[PDB]
Short mmCIF file of C-alpha atoms and ligand atoms in Angstrom, two decimals:
data_model
loop_
_atom_site.label_atom_id
_atom_site.label_comp_id
_atom_site.label_asym_id
_atom_site.label_seq_id
_atom_site.Cartn_x
_atom_site.Cartn_y
_atom_site.Cartn_z
CA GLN A 1 -86.19 -133.49 67.39
CA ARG A 2 -82.99 -134.70 69.04
CA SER A 3 -79.52 -133.55 68.13
CA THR A 4 -77.57 -135.98 65.99
CA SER A 5 -74.42 -137.62 67.33
CA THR A 6 -71.83 -139.75 65.54
CA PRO A 7 -73.45 -142.81 63.90
CA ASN A 8 -72.27 -146.39 63.46
CA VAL A 9 -70.48 -147.26 60.21
CA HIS A 10 -68.75 -150.29 58.67
CA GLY B 1 -64.41 -164.14 82.35
CA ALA B 2 -66.78 -166.11 80.15
CA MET B 3 -64.45 -165.45 77.22
CA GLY B 4 -61.17 -166.29 78.96
CA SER B 5 -60.70 -169.71 77.35
CA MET B 6 -61.03 -168.39 73.76
CA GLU B 7 -58.09 -167.22 71.70
CA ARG B 8 -57.96 -163.51 70.93
CA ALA B 9 -58.07 -164.11 67.16
CA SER B 10 -61.16 -166.31 67.51
CA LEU B 11 -62.91 -163.64 69.58
CA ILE B 12 -62.24 -161.06 66.86
CA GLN B 13 -63.47 -163.48 64.20
CA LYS B 14 -66.63 -164.20 66.19
CA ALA B 15 -67.26 -160.49 66.76
CA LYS B 16 -67.26 -160.03 62.99
CA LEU B 17 -69.71 -162.94 62.54
CA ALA B 18 -71.97 -161.51 65.24
CA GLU B 19 -71.96 -158.15 63.44
CA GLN B 20 -73.00 -159.93 60.24
CA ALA B 21 -75.77 -161.72 62.14
CA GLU B 22 -76.91 -158.48 63.86
CA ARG B 23 -76.20 -160.14 67.22
CA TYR B 24 -74.79 -157.06 68.90
CA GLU B 25 -74.94 -158.29 72.48
CA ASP B 26 -72.83 -161.29 71.45
CA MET B 27 -70.50 -159.08 69.46
CA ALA B 28 -69.99 -156.81 72.49
CA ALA B 29 -69.26 -159.86 74.68
CA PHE B 30 -66.71 -161.12 72.16
CA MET B 31 -64.99 -157.73 71.96
CA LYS B 32 -64.95 -157.39 75.74
CA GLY B 33 -63.19 -160.76 75.83
CA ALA B 34 -60.71 -159.56 73.23
CA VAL B 35 -60.00 -156.37 75.18
CA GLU B 36 -59.41 -158.46 78.31
CA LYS B 37 -56.51 -160.24 76.62
CA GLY B 38 -54.59 -157.07 77.44
CA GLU B 39 -53.27 -156.25 73.96
CA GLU B 40 -53.93 -153.03 72.12
CA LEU B 41 -56.80 -152.85 69.67
CA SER B 42 -56.25 -151.89 66.05
CA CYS B 43 -58.42 -149.18 64.31
CA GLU B 44 -60.53 -152.12 62.75
CA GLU B 45 -60.93 -153.68 66.16
CA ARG B 46 -61.85 -150.43 67.89
CA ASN B 47 -64.60 -150.12 65.31
CA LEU B 48 -65.92 -153.55 66.27
CA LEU B 49 -65.89 -152.59 69.95
CA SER B 50 -67.58 -149.28 69.17
CA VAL B 51 -70.28 -150.72 66.90
CA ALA B 52 -71.21 -153.50 69.32
CA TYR B 53 -71.63 -151.42 72.45
CA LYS B 54 -73.24 -148.49 70.62
CA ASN B 55 -75.91 -150.84 69.23
CA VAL B 56 -76.54 -152.36 72.65
CA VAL B 57 -76.76 -149.08 74.54
CA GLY B 58 -78.59 -147.47 71.60
CA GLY B 59 -81.46 -149.90 71.94
CA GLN B 60 -81.52 -149.33 75.69
CA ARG B 61 -81.56 -145.54 75.26
CA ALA B 62 -84.36 -145.80 72.71
CA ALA B 63 -86.38 -148.00 75.08
CA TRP B 64 -85.66 -145.73 78.05
CA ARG B 65 -86.87 -142.72 76.06
CA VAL B 66 -90.13 -144.46 75.15
CA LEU B 67 -90.79 -145.47 78.75
CA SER B 68 -89.77 -142.09 80.16
CA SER B 69 -92.17 -140.31 77.81
CA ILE B 70 -95.01 -142.63 78.89
CA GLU B 71 -94.02 -142.01 82.51
CA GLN B 72 -94.10 -138.24 82.07
CA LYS B 73 -97.45 -138.30 80.25
CA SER B 74 -98.94 -140.33 83.11
CA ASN B 75 -97.71 -137.66 85.56
CA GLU B 76 -99.30 -134.72 83.70
CA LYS B 77 -101.65 -144.41 87.95
CA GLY B 78 -99.88 -147.56 89.14
CA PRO B 79 -96.16 -148.11 89.73
CA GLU B 80 -95.67 -150.30 86.64
CA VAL B 81 -94.37 -147.67 84.18
CA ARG B 82 -91.84 -146.34 86.70
CA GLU B 83 -90.76 -149.83 87.77
CA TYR B 84 -90.17 -150.91 84.19
CA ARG B 85 -88.41 -147.64 83.28
CA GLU B 86 -86.16 -148.19 86.33
CA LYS B 87 -85.50 -151.75 85.09
CA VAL B 88 -84.33 -150.60 81.66
CA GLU B 89 -82.40 -147.72 83.25
CA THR B 90 -80.50 -150.09 85.54
CA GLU B 91 -79.55 -152.29 82.58
CA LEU B 92 -78.39 -149.23 80.61
CA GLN B 93 -76.24 -148.00 83.49
CA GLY B 94 -74.72 -151.47 83.79
CA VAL B 95 -73.68 -151.46 80.15
CA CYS B 96 -72.19 -147.97 80.49
CA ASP B 97 -70.40 -149.09 83.65
CA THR B 98 -69.01 -152.08 81.76
CA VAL B 99 -67.71 -149.91 78.91
CA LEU B 100 -66.24 -147.29 81.25
CA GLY B 101 -64.58 -150.06 83.24
CA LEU B 102 -62.94 -151.48 80.12
CA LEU B 103 -61.74 -148.01 79.14
CA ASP B 104 -60.21 -147.38 82.58
CA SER B 105 -58.83 -150.88 83.16
CA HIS B 106 -57.51 -151.73 79.72
CA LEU B 107 -57.82 -149.21 76.92
CA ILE B 108 -56.98 -145.64 77.99
CA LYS B 109 -53.19 -145.32 78.03
CA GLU B 110 -50.53 -142.62 77.94
CA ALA B 111 -48.87 -144.28 74.93
CA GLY B 112 -50.37 -145.18 71.56
CA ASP B 113 -51.03 -143.14 68.46
CA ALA B 114 -53.32 -140.11 68.52
CA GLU B 115 -56.23 -142.01 66.95
CA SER B 116 -56.37 -144.53 69.79
CA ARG B 117 -55.99 -142.00 72.58
CA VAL B 118 -58.57 -139.62 71.12
CA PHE B 119 -60.95 -142.44 70.29
CA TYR B 120 -60.98 -143.94 73.80
CA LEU B 121 -61.31 -140.57 75.52
CA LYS B 122 -64.17 -139.76 73.14
CA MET B 123 -65.73 -143.11 74.08
CA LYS B 124 -65.39 -142.25 77.76
CA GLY B 125 -67.13 -138.93 77.15
CA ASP B 126 -69.93 -140.67 75.25
CA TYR B 127 -70.71 -143.30 77.87
CA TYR B 128 -70.64 -140.76 80.69
CA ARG B 129 -73.00 -138.70 78.53
CA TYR B 130 -75.34 -141.69 78.24
CA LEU B 131 -75.24 -142.05 82.04
CA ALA B 132 -76.01 -138.33 82.29
CA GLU B 133 -79.12 -138.76 80.13
CA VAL B 134 -80.69 -140.85 82.93
CA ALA B 135 -79.04 -139.37 86.04
CA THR B 136 -80.64 -137.19 88.72
CA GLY B 137 -79.04 -136.59 92.12
CA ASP B 138 -75.53 -136.12 93.49
CA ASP B 139 -74.52 -138.70 90.90
CA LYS B 140 -75.56 -136.39 88.05
CA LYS B 141 -73.06 -133.64 88.86
CA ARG B 142 -70.22 -136.17 89.13
CA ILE B 143 -71.18 -137.76 85.79
CA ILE B 144 -71.56 -134.50 83.85
CA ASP B 145 -68.13 -133.26 84.92
CA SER B 146 -66.60 -136.65 84.08
CA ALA B 147 -68.01 -136.50 80.55
CA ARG B 148 -66.79 -132.94 79.99
CA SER B 149 -63.28 -133.70 81.28
CA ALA B 150 -62.94 -136.74 79.01
CA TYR B 151 -64.21 -134.82 75.98
CA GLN B 152 -61.92 -131.89 76.75
CA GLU B 153 -58.83 -134.07 77.04
CA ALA B 154 -59.76 -135.71 73.74
CA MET B 155 -60.20 -132.31 72.07
CA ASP B 156 -56.83 -131.01 73.30
CA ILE B 157 -55.10 -134.05 71.82
CA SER B 158 -57.05 -134.03 68.54
CA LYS B 159 -56.29 -130.36 67.86
CA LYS B 160 -52.55 -130.88 68.41
CA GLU B 161 -52.09 -134.31 66.78
CA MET B 162 -54.75 -134.60 64.07
CA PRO B 163 -55.77 -132.76 60.89
CA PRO B 164 -59.06 -130.86 61.19
CA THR B 165 -60.75 -133.32 58.76
CA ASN B 166 -59.74 -136.42 60.72
CA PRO B 167 -63.00 -138.40 61.21
CA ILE B 168 -62.27 -139.23 64.86
CA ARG B 169 -61.53 -135.57 65.55
CA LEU B 170 -64.73 -134.61 63.72
CA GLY B 171 -66.88 -137.25 65.44
CA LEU B 172 -65.50 -136.22 68.82
CA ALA B 173 -66.31 -132.54 68.18
CA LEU B 174 -69.77 -133.48 66.92
CA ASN B 175 -70.41 -135.52 70.07
CA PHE B 176 -68.95 -132.85 72.36
CA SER B 177 -71.29 -130.29 70.79
CA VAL B 178 -74.25 -132.61 71.41
CA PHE B 179 -73.06 -132.80 75.03
CA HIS B 180 -73.04 -129.00 75.25
CA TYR B 181 -76.50 -128.67 73.72
CA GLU B 182 -78.39 -131.60 75.24
CA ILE B 183 -76.59 -132.29 78.54
CA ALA B 184 -74.79 -129.13 79.68
CA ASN B 185 -77.55 -126.71 78.58
CA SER B 186 -74.96 -124.55 76.77
CA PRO B 187 -76.41 -123.96 73.29
CA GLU B 188 -73.90 -121.16 72.62
CA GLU B 189 -70.96 -123.50 73.28
CA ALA B 190 -72.56 -126.25 71.18
CA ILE B 191 -73.17 -123.91 68.24
CA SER B 192 -69.74 -122.28 68.38
CA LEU B 193 -67.99 -125.66 68.69
CA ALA B 194 -69.92 -127.19 65.78
CA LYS B 195 -69.47 -124.13 63.57
CA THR B 196 -65.74 -123.86 64.35
CA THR B 197 -65.29 -127.56 63.65
CA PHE B 198 -67.15 -127.41 60.34
CA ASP B 199 -65.45 -124.23 59.14
CA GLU B 200 -61.99 -125.46 60.10
CA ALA B 201 -62.53 -128.76 58.29
CA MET B 202 -63.66 -126.83 55.22
CA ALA B 203 -60.73 -124.42 55.38
CA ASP B 204 -58.33 -127.38 55.40
CA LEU B 205 -60.41 -129.68 53.17
CA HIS B 206 -57.26 -130.80 51.32
CA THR B 207 -56.31 -132.85 54.41
CA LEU B 208 -59.01 -135.42 53.69
CA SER B 209 -57.54 -138.92 53.67
CA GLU B 210 -58.12 -141.40 50.84
CA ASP B 211 -59.03 -144.13 53.31
CA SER B 212 -61.54 -142.16 55.43
CA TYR B 213 -62.85 -139.18 53.44
CA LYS B 214 -66.36 -140.60 53.21
CA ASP B 215 -66.47 -140.74 57.01
CA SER B 216 -65.15 -137.19 57.34
CA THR B 217 -67.67 -135.74 54.92
CA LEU B 218 -70.52 -137.57 56.65
CA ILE B 219 -69.67 -136.01 60.02
CA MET B 220 -69.27 -132.60 58.37
CA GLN B 221 -72.83 -132.90 57.07
CA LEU B 222 -74.06 -133.93 60.53
CA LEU B 223 -72.39 -130.87 62.04
CA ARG B 224 -74.29 -128.74 59.51
CA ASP B 225 -77.56 -130.57 60.27
CA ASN B 226 -77.19 -129.78 63.98
CA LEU B 227 -76.28 -126.17 63.21
CA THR B 228 -79.43 -125.88 61.10
CA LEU B 229 -81.56 -127.42 63.85
CA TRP B 230 -80.02 -125.16 66.52
CA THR B 231 -80.40 -121.96 64.46
CA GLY C 1 -90.08 -168.04 88.57
CA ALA C 2 -88.54 -164.59 88.25
CA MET C 3 -92.03 -163.20 87.67
CA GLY C 4 -93.79 -165.03 90.51
CA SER C 5 -94.02 -162.05 92.87
CA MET C 6 -95.73 -159.77 90.30
CA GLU C 7 -99.48 -159.52 89.92
CA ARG C 8 -100.93 -160.89 86.70
CA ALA C 9 -102.40 -157.52 85.70
CA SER C 10 -99.03 -155.81 86.20
CA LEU C 11 -97.32 -158.42 84.03
CA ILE C 12 -99.82 -157.77 81.23
CA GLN C 13 -99.34 -154.02 81.61
CA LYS C 14 -95.56 -154.40 81.50
CA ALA C 15 -95.75 -156.66 78.44
CA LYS C 16 -97.59 -153.86 76.65
CA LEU C 17 -94.95 -151.31 77.70
CA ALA C 18 -92.17 -153.63 76.54
CA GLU C 19 -93.90 -153.97 73.16
CA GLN C 20 -94.00 -150.17 72.90
CA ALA C 21 -90.31 -150.01 73.80
CA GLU C 22 -89.42 -152.81 71.32
CA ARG C 23 -88.04 -154.83 74.25
CA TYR C 24 -89.30 -158.18 73.04
CA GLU C 25 -87.21 -160.38 75.32
CA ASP C 26 -88.67 -158.52 78.31
CA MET C 27 -92.14 -158.71 76.85
CA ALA C 28 -91.80 -162.49 76.40
CA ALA C 29 -90.60 -162.84 80.01
CA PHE C 30 -93.59 -160.82 81.24
CA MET C 31 -96.04 -162.91 79.22
CA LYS C 32 -94.43 -166.15 80.40
CA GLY C 33 -94.99 -164.90 83.95
CA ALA C 34 -98.60 -164.11 83.13
CA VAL C 35 -99.16 -167.56 81.62
CA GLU C 36 -97.68 -169.13 84.75
CA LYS C 37 -100.43 -167.60 86.88
CA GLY C 38 -102.54 -170.45 85.51
CA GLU C 39 -105.47 -168.43 84.14
CA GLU C 40 -106.60 -168.48 80.54
CA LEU C 41 -105.34 -165.83 78.16
CA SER C 42 -107.72 -163.58 76.27
CA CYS C 43 -107.38 -163.03 72.45
CA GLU C 44 -105.53 -159.66 73.26
CA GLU C 45 -103.22 -161.47 75.62
CA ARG C 46 -102.51 -164.34 73.24
CA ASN C 47 -101.44 -161.69 70.76
CA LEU C 48 -98.97 -160.29 73.28
CA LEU C 49 -97.56 -163.78 73.91
CA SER C 50 -97.36 -164.44 70.18
CA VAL C 51 -95.73 -161.13 69.25
CA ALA C 52 -93.09 -161.36 71.98
CA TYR C 53 -91.86 -164.88 71.29
CA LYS C 54 -92.11 -164.52 67.51
CA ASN C 55 -89.86 -161.45 67.65
CA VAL C 56 -87.35 -163.23 69.88
CA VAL C 57 -87.18 -166.43 67.85
CA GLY C 58 -87.40 -164.43 64.61
CA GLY C 59 -84.16 -162.64 65.39
CA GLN C 60 -82.55 -165.95 66.32
CA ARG C 61 -83.72 -167.60 63.08
CA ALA C 62 -82.44 -164.66 61.05
CA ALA C 63 -79.06 -164.87 62.80
CA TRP C 64 -78.92 -168.65 62.42
CA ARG C 65 -79.61 -168.32 58.69
CA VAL C 66 -76.78 -165.79 58.26
CA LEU C 67 -74.31 -167.98 60.13
CA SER C 68 -75.43 -171.18 58.41
CA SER C 69 -74.94 -169.59 54.99
CA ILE C 70 -71.43 -168.48 55.98
CA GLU C 71 -70.77 -171.98 57.29
CA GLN C 72 -71.92 -173.60 54.05
CA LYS C 73 -69.89 -171.21 51.89
CA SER C 74 -66.77 -172.04 53.92
CA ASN C 75 -67.42 -175.75 53.26
CA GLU C 76 -67.70 -175.40 49.46
CA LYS C 77 -61.18 -173.05 57.80
CA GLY C 78 -61.29 -172.82 61.59
CA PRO C 79 -64.04 -173.99 63.95
CA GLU C 80 -65.28 -170.48 64.78
CA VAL C 81 -68.21 -170.24 62.32
CA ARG C 82 -69.57 -173.64 63.36
CA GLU C 83 -69.05 -172.95 67.07
CA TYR C 84 -70.90 -169.65 66.85
CA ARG C 85 -73.69 -171.12 64.69
CA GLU C 86 -74.05 -173.88 67.30
CA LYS C 87 -74.23 -171.18 70.00
CA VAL C 88 -77.09 -169.34 68.31
CA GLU C 89 -78.78 -172.65 67.48
CA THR C 90 -78.71 -173.76 71.11
CA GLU C 91 -80.29 -170.46 72.21
CA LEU C 92 -82.98 -170.80 69.53
CA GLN C 93 -83.82 -174.35 70.61
CA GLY C 94 -84.05 -173.15 74.21
CA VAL C 95 -86.60 -170.50 73.30
CA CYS C 96 -88.63 -173.02 71.30
CA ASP C 97 -88.41 -175.45 74.21
CA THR C 98 -89.66 -172.72 76.54
CA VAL C 99 -92.65 -171.92 74.31
CA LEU C 100 -93.53 -175.58 73.75
CA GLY C 101 -93.28 -176.17 77.50
CA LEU C 102 -95.72 -173.34 78.21
CA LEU C 103 -98.11 -174.71 75.59
CA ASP C 104 -98.00 -178.21 77.08
CA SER C 105 -97.98 -177.20 80.75
CA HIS C 106 -100.44 -174.33 80.74
CA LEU C 107 -102.14 -173.33 77.51
CA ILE C 108 -103.31 -176.30 75.42
CA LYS C 109 -106.60 -177.52 76.91
CA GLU C 110 -109.61 -179.58 75.92
CA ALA C 111 -111.95 -176.73 76.87
CA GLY C 112 -111.98 -173.14 75.64
CA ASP C 113 -113.38 -171.54 72.53
CA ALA C 114 -112.21 -172.59 69.06
CA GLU C 115 -109.96 -169.54 68.67
CA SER C 116 -107.87 -170.45 71.70
CA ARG C 117 -107.59 -174.14 70.90
CA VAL C 118 -106.71 -173.53 67.25
CA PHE C 119 -104.31 -170.74 68.12
CA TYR C 120 -102.29 -172.76 70.64
CA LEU C 121 -102.12 -175.84 68.43
CA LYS C 122 -100.99 -173.59 65.57
CA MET C 123 -98.35 -172.16 67.91
CA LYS C 124 -97.18 -175.66 68.77
CA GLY C 125 -96.87 -176.47 65.07
CA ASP C 126 -94.89 -173.27 64.46
CA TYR C 127 -92.33 -173.79 67.22
CA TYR C 128 -91.78 -177.42 66.27
CA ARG C 129 -91.32 -176.14 62.72
CA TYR C 130 -88.67 -173.70 63.95
CA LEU C 131 -86.92 -176.59 65.72
CA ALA C 132 -87.15 -178.56 62.47
CA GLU C 133 -85.38 -175.76 60.58
CA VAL C 134 -82.21 -176.49 62.60
CA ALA C 135 -82.59 -180.22 63.34
CA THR C 136 -80.58 -183.11 61.86
CA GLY C 137 -80.55 -186.58 63.40
CA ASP C 138 -83.02 -188.88 65.14
CA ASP C 139 -84.38 -185.69 66.70
CA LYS C 140 -85.41 -184.34 63.29
CA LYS C 141 -87.90 -187.12 62.52
CA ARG C 142 -89.51 -186.76 65.96
CA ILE C 143 -89.80 -182.97 65.54
CA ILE C 144 -91.23 -183.03 62.01
CA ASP C 145 -93.99 -185.47 62.98
CA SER C 146 -94.76 -183.40 66.09
CA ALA C 147 -95.21 -180.26 63.99
CA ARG C 148 -97.46 -182.02 61.47
CA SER C 149 -99.65 -183.59 64.17
CA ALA C 150 -100.16 -180.25 65.92
CA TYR C 151 -100.98 -178.48 62.65
CA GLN C 152 -103.35 -181.26 61.62
CA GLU C 153 -105.26 -181.17 64.90
CA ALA C 154 -105.54 -177.40 64.55
CA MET C 155 -106.83 -177.73 60.98
CA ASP C 156 -109.48 -180.31 61.94
CA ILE C 157 -110.82 -177.97 64.62
CA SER C 158 -110.66 -174.82 62.47
CA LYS C 159 -112.60 -176.42 59.60
CA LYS C 160 -115.38 -177.58 61.94
CA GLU C 161 -115.60 -174.58 64.29
CA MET C 162 -114.50 -171.53 62.28
CA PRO C 163 -115.58 -169.67 59.14
CA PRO C 164 -113.16 -170.04 56.22
CA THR C 165 -112.18 -166.33 56.51
CA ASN C 166 -111.31 -166.54 60.20
CA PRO C 167 -107.80 -165.02 60.50
CA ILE C 168 -106.53 -167.71 62.88
CA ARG C 169 -107.82 -170.40 60.53
CA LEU C 170 -106.19 -168.59 57.61
CA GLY C 171 -102.88 -168.00 59.40
CA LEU C 172 -102.78 -171.64 60.48
CA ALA C 173 -103.36 -172.85 56.91
CA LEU C 174 -100.76 -170.41 55.60
CA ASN C 175 -98.23 -171.70 58.14
CA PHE C 176 -99.13 -175.34 57.53
CA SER C 177 -98.55 -174.81 53.80
CA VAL C 178 -95.13 -173.30 54.55
CA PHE C 179 -94.44 -176.43 56.62
CA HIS C 180 -95.37 -178.62 53.65
CA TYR C 181 -93.22 -176.64 51.22
CA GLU C 182 -90.14 -175.81 53.30
CA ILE C 183 -89.98 -178.58 55.92
CA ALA C 184 -91.82 -181.66 54.63
CA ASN C 185 -90.63 -181.32 51.00
CA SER C 186 -94.23 -181.69 49.76
CA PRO C 187 -94.75 -178.81 47.31
CA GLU C 188 -97.94 -180.42 45.95
CA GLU C 189 -99.50 -180.50 49.43
CA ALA C 190 -98.37 -176.93 50.11
CA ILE C 191 -99.82 -175.64 46.84
CA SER C 192 -103.10 -177.52 47.15
CA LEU C 193 -103.55 -176.45 50.78
CA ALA C 194 -102.82 -172.79 50.04
CA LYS C 195 -105.04 -172.74 46.95
CA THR C 196 -107.91 -174.51 48.72
CA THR C 197 -107.63 -172.11 51.65
CA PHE C 198 -107.60 -169.03 49.42
CA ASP C 199 -110.45 -170.20 47.18
CA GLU C 200 -112.62 -171.25 50.12
CA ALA C 201 -112.10 -167.90 51.84
CA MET C 202 -113.06 -166.14 48.62
CA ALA C 203 -116.12 -168.33 48.07
CA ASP C 204 -117.35 -167.42 51.56
CA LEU C 205 -115.99 -163.85 51.62
CA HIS C 206 -119.21 -162.61 53.26
CA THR C 207 -118.06 -164.27 56.52
CA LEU C 208 -115.41 -161.60 57.08
CA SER C 209 -115.74 -160.13 60.56
CA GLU C 210 -115.87 -156.38 61.23
CA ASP C 211 -113.24 -156.68 63.94
CA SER C 212 -110.67 -158.76 62.01
CA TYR C 213 -111.26 -158.39 58.26
CA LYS C 214 -108.00 -156.51 57.71
CA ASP C 215 -106.14 -159.47 59.21
CA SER C 216 -108.06 -161.97 57.08
CA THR C 217 -107.41 -160.11 53.85
CA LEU C 218 -103.71 -159.78 54.67
CA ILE C 219 -103.31 -163.55 55.08
CA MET C 220 -105.31 -164.12 51.89
CA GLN C 221 -102.81 -161.96 50.02
CA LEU C 222 -99.91 -163.88 51.59
CA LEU C 223 -101.45 -167.17 50.45
CA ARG C 224 -101.56 -165.74 46.92
CA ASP C 225 -97.96 -164.52 47.19
CA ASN C 226 -96.79 -168.02 48.13
CA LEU C 227 -98.87 -169.56 45.34
CA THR C 228 -97.24 -167.18 42.87
CA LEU C 229 -93.77 -168.00 44.18
CA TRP C 230 -94.46 -171.76 44.08
CA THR C 231 -95.93 -171.69 40.54
CA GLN D 1 -86.60 -166.40 48.29
CA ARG D 2 -88.24 -167.94 51.34
CA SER D 3 -91.91 -168.75 51.66
CA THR D 4 -93.89 -166.25 53.70
CA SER D 5 -95.52 -167.31 56.97
CA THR D 6 -97.96 -165.43 59.19
CA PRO D 7 -96.52 -162.06 60.30
CA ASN D 8 -96.77 -160.13 63.55
CA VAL D 9 -99.54 -157.52 63.84
CA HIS D 10 -100.90 -155.14 66.49
C1 WQ9 E 301 -59.22 -145.97 63.30
C2 WQ9 E 301 -60.12 -145.99 64.53
O1 WQ9 E 301 -59.64 -145.99 65.65
N1 WQ9 E 301 -61.45 -146.06 64.34
C3 WQ9 E 301 -62.26 -145.59 63.21
C4 WQ9 E 301 -63.61 -146.11 63.70
C5 WQ9 E 301 -63.66 -145.84 65.23
C6 WQ9 E 301 -65.00 -146.46 65.69
C7 WQ9 E 301 -65.95 -145.29 65.67
N2 WQ9 E 301 -65.07 -144.11 65.84
S1 WQ9 E 301 -65.79 -142.66 65.88
O2 WQ9 E 301 -66.81 -142.74 66.88
O3 WQ9 E 301 -64.75 -141.70 66.00
C8 WQ9 E 301 -66.60 -142.43 64.32
C9 WQ9 E 301 -67.75 -143.13 64.02
C10 WQ9 E 301 -68.39 -142.95 62.80
C11 WQ9 E 301 -67.88 -142.06 61.88
BR1 WQ9 E 301 -68.74 -141.79 60.20
C12 WQ9 E 301 -66.73 -141.37 62.20
F1 WQ9 E 301 -66.22 -140.50 61.33
C13 WQ9 E 301 -66.08 -141.53 63.41
C14 WQ9 E 301 -63.91 -144.35 64.95
C15 WQ9 E 301 -62.37 -146.69 65.28
C1 WQ9 E 302 -108.03 -163.70 69.11
C2 WQ9 E 302 -106.70 -164.44 69.18
O1 WQ9 E 302 -106.59 -165.47 69.83
N1 WQ9 E 302 -105.64 -163.90 68.56
C3 WQ9 E 302 -105.59 -163.02 67.39
C4 WQ9 E 302 -104.08 -162.77 67.37
C5 WQ9 E 302 -103.41 -164.14 67.71
C6 WQ9 E 302 -101.90 -163.82 67.77
C7 WQ9 E 302 -101.42 -164.17 66.39
N2 WQ9 E 302 -102.40 -165.17 65.91
S1 WQ9 E 302 -102.15 -165.77 64.42
O2 WQ9 E 302 -100.81 -166.27 64.40
O3 WQ9 E 302 -103.24 -166.67 64.17
C8 WQ9 E 302 -102.24 -164.43 63.28
C9 WQ9 E 302 -101.22 -163.51 63.20
C10 WQ9 E 302 -101.28 -162.45 62.31
C11 WQ9 E 302 -102.37 -162.32 61.47
BR1 WQ9 E 302 -102.47 -160.88 60.22
C12 WQ9 E 302 -103.39 -163.25 61.56
F1 WQ9 E 302 -104.45 -163.14 60.76
C13 WQ9 E 302 -103.35 -164.31 62.44
C14 WQ9 E 302 -103.72 -164.64 66.29
C15 WQ9 E 302 -104.26 -164.08 69.00
CL1 CL E 303 -90.23 -154.24 85.93
CL1 CL E 304 -69.17 -169.27 70.17
MG1 MG E 305 -53.22 -170.47 72.41
MG1 MG E 306 -105.92 -139.85 88.93
MG1 MG E 307 -82.05 -145.88 88.54
MG1 MG E 308 -102.42 -159.67 95.02
MG1 MG E 309 -58.33 -175.12 52.55
MG1 MG E 310 -77.15 -177.99 68.16
#
């Protein structure tokens, strides 16, 4: 499982 | 160059339509054209730039990861998997080179508010990090140090200029900690950065902003998800 | 032309990798190169061709529909929505023109088994139908009749050569009925074709094939979904 | 709601 980075929003 | 005849406002408008249509390659081209007009980008407009290129490179990274896994399984017997992985890799590097070029040529400035300066330096760290995901040789050292330096400059500014719940400050720290864990092979630094960021946001939770608190609390949860995965 | 130096087998292999990577534009380019070698395509390979181009044009149709809806709402005030809708439309027409060109130049033949002949004529009907979704003037009449003629030739062959549960025969009838309902403005023809197809598949349900029955029963359910929506 | 045509599979 990969680390989670900042996602896209709005 | 393809966008040079269009008015800036029309490029922004078309980027928003392309987002609605899920045409992210078009929306990145429109935003590149807007950046090339040479005026600053608002917070709304930086979001358009960010969303477009992240979608484009995100699909390329996802494809590269599929092909690389197939390539590694077949090494554990023709050239086709490697050739096609190299194809996708070259396209990914080109998109990162395009974004980094726009940052260096147009967007990263000494002036501007803290949000803009931190955001662009964060972006530079991210797209060097994406290049580092697929790098190997003498290039790989150069890229990894370039990512770290951009992230570090962004962190110094965010800690001095921004509340500890600011969503750009949080997203930068989240992404820097991913860099430490996944790229730099420094799990201790990743864990301590993510924990410090989360705890300091919680300690000063009253600094949440009415216009962005949902973004802040989302990143805070993602910091805690990574901390749970890493511990 | 871009694919001319690659061996046919490598193009097939790379189309399968591109499918795994969800790189459908690449997978369509690889399959176009394979078709251009001038050899027949197997049932597996026709599926690769079909999946690639349907994904590509599917995303274009979805985008076109978003932009067209925005355009119609703004007519109920700049040129940007229309210009960008025209952009996406032109790209969609180009992909349909590419597929129809491959069908005419390489794939549609007098010889071959029934599956291949029905499948390609069905494909021709589909991509004319997609052109008809965005057509207007003197072009629109020409396109609509071209779709109907291709579907009709495919139906004549499928009824003579194929069991009534054959998934290509079923998918063709399903798509022809959509043509009748959505393009030709003939709901009666659409309903009677879909009902006849469903009932005749059910009456001869014993003709389901071990290697394709899951496909057949899926199309049968989609025929019933359309019949429920249309009644 | 649009009519449903043949989907992609496999
Ligand atoms: C005001 C401004 O410059 N902004 C806000 C949006 C962006 C575009 C994406 N960044 S981010 O990467 O810092 C970020 C993304 C998602 C989330 Br939930 C977040 F908190 C930050 C900020 C442009
Ligand atoms: C054997 C052969 O020529 N085939 C089978 C697959 C294809 C590619 C898609 N067609 S189709 O459009 O007729 C079709 C698609 C999906 C489903 Br569930 C179906 F039953 C038919 C057949 C190539
Ligand atoms: Cl390749
Ligand atoms: Cl346009
Ligand atoms: Mg002007
Ligand atoms: Mg061996
Ligand atoms: Mg390379
Ligand atoms: Mg040879
Ligand atoms: Mg008015
Ligand atoms: Mg047009």
